[PDB]
Amino acid sequence: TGYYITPRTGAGA
Amino acid sequence: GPPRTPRPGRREPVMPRPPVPANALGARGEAVRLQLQGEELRLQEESVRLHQINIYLSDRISLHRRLPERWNPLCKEKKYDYDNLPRTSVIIAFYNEAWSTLLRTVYSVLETSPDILLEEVILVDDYSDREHLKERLANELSGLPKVRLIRANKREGLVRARLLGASAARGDVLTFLDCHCECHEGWLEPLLQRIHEEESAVVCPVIDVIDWNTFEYLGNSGEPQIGGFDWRLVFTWHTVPERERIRMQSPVDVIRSPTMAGGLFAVSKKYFEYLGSYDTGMEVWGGENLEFSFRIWQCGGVLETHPCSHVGHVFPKQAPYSRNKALANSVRAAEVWMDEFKELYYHRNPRARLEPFGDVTERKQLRDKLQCKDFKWFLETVYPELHVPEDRPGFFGMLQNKGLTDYCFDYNPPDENQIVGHQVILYLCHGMGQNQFFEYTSQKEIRYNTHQPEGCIAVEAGMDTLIMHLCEETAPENQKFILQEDGSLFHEQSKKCVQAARSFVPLLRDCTNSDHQKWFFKERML
Ligand SMILES: O=c1ccn([C@@H]2O[C@H](COP(=O)(O)OP(=O)(O)O)[C@@H](O)[C@H]2O)c(=O)[nH]1
Ligand SMILES: *[C@H]1O[C@H](CO)[C@H](O)[C@H](O)[C@H]1NC(C)=O
Ligand SMILES: *[C@H]1O[C@H](CO)[C@H](O)[C@H](O)[C@H]1NC(C)=O
Ligand SMILES: [Mn+2]
Ligand SMILES: [Mn+2]
Incomplete structure (x- = not known):
């Protein structure tokens, strides 16, 4: 076993 | 105007x-x-x-x-x-x-x-x-x-x-x-x-x-x-x-x-x-x-x-x-x-x-x-x-066992976001980091910090297993390890040593001169 996207923010805040 | x-x-x-x-x-x-x-x-x-x-x-x-x-x-x-x-x-x-x-x-x-x-x-x-x-x-x-x-x-x-x-x-x-x-x-x-x-x-x-x-x-x-x-x-x-x-x-x-x-x-x-x-x-x-x-x-x-x-x-x-x-x-x-x-x-x-x-x-x-x-x-x-x-030099990378050759600390949480509350185990060293990357710090904690939040190894009251906690501002007592020159990994609160034990896991045991209680950091495998 072992940076391809920009994260969205979580539903939290 | x-x-x-x-x-x-x-x-x-x-x-x-x-x-x-x-x-x-x-x-x-x-x-x-x-x-x-x-x-x-x-x-x-x-x-x-x-x-x-x-x-x-x-x-x-x-x-x-x-x-x-x-x-x-x-x-x-x-x-x-x-x-x-x-x-x-x-x-x-x-x-x-x-x-x-x-x-x-x-x-x-x-x-x-x-x-x-x-x-x-x-x-x-x-x-x-x-x-x-x-x-x-x-x-x-x-x-x-x-x-x-x-x-x-x-x-x-x-x-x-x-x-x-x-x-x-x-x-x-x-x-x-x-x-x-x-x-x-x-x-x-x-x-x-x-x-x-x-x-x-x-x-x-x-x-x-x-x-x-x-x-x-x-x-x-x-x-x-x-x-x-x-x-x-x-x-x-x-x-x-x-x-x-x-x-x-x-x-x-x-x-x-x-x-x-x-x-x-x-x-x-x-x-x-x-x-x-x-x-x-x-x-x-x-x-x-x-x-x-x-x-x-x-x-x-x-x-x-x-x-x-x-x-x-x-x-x-x-x-x-x-x-x-x-x-x-x-x-x-x-x-x-x-x-x-x-x-x-x-x-x-x-x-x-x-x-x-x-x-x-x-x-x-x-x-x-x-x-x-x-x-x-x-x-x-x-x-x-x-x-x-x-x-610090010699204090980060894979945490490998001297006695149990080619095995090192390994932690893989179920969710990459929620890392708290699972057992650290031992696993054949692969040199790819992430799950086998650890850092021993000046505050005596074993940190799991390829990504955030930083995890710190702990031992819960009266147990012998190593569990993943979050690092805090002041290191709690159950997260403090002493890594001695010879390789002994001593848990301060238990007064016990970390030992490569039978799959394989690190467990607290009474301190001996066994190589299964000796640990060292390696940046690379070769
Ligand atoms: O080689 C490229 C790659 C992307 N884009 C554009 O530049 C912005 C890059 O954002 P993208 O949405 O693909 O990245 P993301 O927001 O998902 O991180 C977008 O308008 C893309 O259409 C571009 O002009 N040339
Ligand atoms: C991939 O997963 C295995 C088993 O879950 C090990 O935890 C291994 O350490 C992981 N690989 C990497 C590079 O983190
Ligand atoms: C995350 O927070 C941002 C505001 O900083 C936006 O509200 C975004 O829509 C949020 N993401 C989700 C999935 O609700
Ligand atoms: Mn025009
Ligand atoms: Mn975009």
């Missing part, structure tokens, strides 16, 4: 919104799930497979839809001095975007931006190969007011395509958007007003989610997240610290942000050029937002999120095209801006050591010409809540 005649121009948007069908899909920014069957269902699946966005649905949502009001009501109280605000060129580079998402971006800008403030919308075709973006696009845009379409001659990547747009721009302020955005009402005035106050401010909207499958708008009126990064040099979001919240005079004032999500921001054109714009050595995608953030802070500007400016963004299901240059781009940023702290990066992403990154001589000369502050300053002043690892 008599009132003066104001500056002429309409405060209303460049274009009015066409009449809406009352029953139109997605009209109020609501989630739409079409529940298709048969061939229509297959066409929807093919559109997701081809765009990583439900373009089947987007094609059935109005290109002129008005986002619902979601901002903090105090933003409606803001009065703007339209007669003195600068004019902006909106720059939208696009590569193989779908028809409906791109055109909805353009109509959103034209239908929400005050005419008096918008110089032009500049579309930059980064050498797209999809046919609908060729003559069909030029024909559809040809009659629109305040729209220019510029085409690259070869594949440029988002950095150099954006610079094509900036080079052609006629406004005082450059505003960058992606080709799959939708603007909240009133998004532009706060950005321009802030740059009107401070020429060296780079100002970003709060980026709201538009869901790639349902096109639901997820903007809200709460305090937004702001930008940071971890020591893999990947952008992450975090909550506004108390230090910054104390300095805000109201909830809708601007918020300083260590880094930008990238791609959505406004900046004076003269200031963007003064700072050296973008590193033209970056390719395709990734890493430029971090380099630009570091450059802004270290070279004397401010990077800010404006809570009154909201822009929705269609985050895709996954990468819609090959993103194989983010690592090299991040290395260019690290080599120019991070000084000795680049090593903390190389330790946690060893592939970066091998990645060709080209020539950064001119960016280093840029840094000297602008007399920029160093990276230690940036960490201590802009981003002090980011934990800075020590990575």
Whole structure:
């Protein structure tokens, strides 16, 4: 076993 | 004396919104799930497979839809001095975007931006190969007011395509958007007003989610997240610290942000050029937002999120095209801006050591010409809540057992976000890091900190197993280990030693001279 996207923010805040 | 005649121009948007069908899909920014069957269902699946966005649905949502009001009501109280605000060129580079998402971006800008403030919308075709973006696009845009379409001659990547747009721009302020955005009402005035106050401010909207499958708008009126990064040099979001919240005079004032999500921001054109714009050595995608953030802070500007400016963004299901240059781009940023702290990066992403990154001589000369502050300053002043690892020689890497040859500490949480509460085990060493990367610190903790939040090994009351906790400000007693010269790993609270035990796990046992209680760090396997 072992940076391809920009994260969205979580539903939290 | 008599009132003066104001500056002429309409405060209303460049274009009015066409009449809406009352029953139109997605009209109020609501989630739409079409529940298709048969061939229509297959066409929807093919559109997701081809765009990583439900373009089947987007094609059935109005290109002129008005986002619902979601901002903090105090933003409606803001009065703007339209007669003195600068004019902006909106720059939208696009590569193989779908028809409906791109055109909805353009109509959103034209239908929400005050005419008096918008110089032009500049579309930059980064050498797209999809046919609908060729003559069909030029024909559809040809009659629109305040729209220019510029085409690259070869594949440029988002950095150099954006610079094509900036080079052609006629406004005082450059505003960058992606080709799959939708603007909240009133998004532009706060950005321009802030740059009107401070020429060296780079100002970003709060980026709201538009869901790639349902096109639901997820903007809200709460305090937004702001930008940071971890020591893999990947952008992450975090909550506004108390230090910054104390300095805000109201909830809708601007918020300083260590880094930008990238791609959505406004900046004076003269200031963007003064700072050296973008590193033209970056390719395709990734890493430029971090380099630009570091450059802004270290070279004397401010990077800010404006809570009154909201822009929705269609985050895709996954990468819609090959993103194989983010690592090299991040290395260019690290080599120019991070000084000795680049090593903390190389330790946690060893592939970066091998990645060709080209020539950064001119960016280093840029840094000297602008007399920029160093990276230690940036960490201590802009981003002090980011934990800075020590990575002391001999105290980081894989934590290998002397007696049980070729086995090392291994921790794999179920969810990458929730790391707390599972047992650390032993596993054949593979040298790839992440699950086998640990750092023994000066505060006697065994840290699991390839990414954030940092985990610290602990032993719960009366147990012999090693469990993953979160690191805290003051190390709790059950997290303190003493790593002696000979290799013994001594748990202070238990008064016991860590022993490689039978799969294989590390367990507390009474201290002996056994090699199964001897440990050592290895950076690399060979
Ligand atoms: O080689 C490229 C890659 C992307 N883009 C465009 O530049 C912006 C890059 O953003 P993208 O949305 O793909 O990245 P993300 O927001 O998902 O991180 C978008 O408008 C893309 O259309 C481009 O012009 N050339
Ligand atoms: C992949 O998973 C295995 C088993 O879950 C191990 O935890 C291994 O350490 C992981 N690989 C990496 C590189 O983290
Ligand atoms: C995350 O927070 C931002 C504000 O900073 C946006 O509201 C975004 O829509 C949020 N993400 C989700 C999925 O709701
Ligand atoms: Mn035109
Ligand atoms: Mn995007």
